[PDB]
Amino acid sequence: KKAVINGEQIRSISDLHQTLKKELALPEYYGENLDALWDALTGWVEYPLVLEWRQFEQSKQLTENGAESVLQVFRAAKAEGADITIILS
């Protein structure tokens, strides 16, 4: 499974979760929060998974530390054993 995020288009943390919902084929009930993301990355999403995050810095702006908190859940999922490849470009 492949997921793409165009950072320069992320204007809010809300934008980020909805983009992920689409890109990761998350359930319609997706909670759009850090706990729901972890739950999706470890008990829903397909593997192997590749997350390509373009213009990460720019998205880091219009979301505060939100982008960083979301990224940390992905890295945390990887540490848990999930086959996720993160590209920060």
Place this chain on the structure above:
Amino acid sequence: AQVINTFDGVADYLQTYHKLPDNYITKSEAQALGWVASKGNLADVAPGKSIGGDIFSNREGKLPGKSGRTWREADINYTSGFRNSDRILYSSDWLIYKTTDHYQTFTKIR
């Protein structure tokens, strides 16, 4: 087998026996049995089981945190197919909460 997978059934069980009912298995254990989340095949590889018992990191900080307290979660109302949006959350000192909207909001029940 007698599956217990309701909010009050599991909540009561959690408080009376300090552990989940026998119909629960962690994500890791489900995997070792052939569970592939994206296949929604949990019931096929482990009939009558539900995902439960894994550590809950309370990443949004919505549940009350405290030194020495660790949270865990377990799926509620699951029977077969893909996982739903219901979860029971319990701490080491037995505070019990629930969510039916995929962790957006929680309700204390014990």
